[PDB]
């Protein structure tokens, strides 16, 4: 019965590790893209010298 409880409730660690690495990479890319978007705004100053 506790083996069945484990089968219903336990999770494989390898897939979670892969997801953690993927989400860390996605967070890094999202942060870089957000920084680029923020830096995009101030380019308009060249028109107004």
């Amino acid at each position: 019965i506790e083996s069945g409880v484990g089968r219903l409730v336990d999770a494989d660690m390898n897939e979670e590790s892969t997801r953690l690495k993927a989400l860390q990479t996605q967070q890094q890319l999202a942060i870089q893209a957000l920084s680029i978007a923020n830096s995009d705004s101030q380019n308009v100053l060249s028109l107004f010298r």
């Binding site: 996605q26 890319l29 999202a30 893209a33 957000l34």
Partner: protein, 49 residues
Amino acid sequence: TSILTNNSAMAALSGVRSISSSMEDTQSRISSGLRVGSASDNAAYWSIA
């Protein structure tokens, strides 16, 4: 030379608008992945996904 109209400036404005739209699309695409990210993309592939 007319001080009331500027054809070169208007063409540059249209070019800037096109570049801004393309940059926004690519920035969202790189932020969230998802080459087909919304229904505004290829509708059939979005529905299949």
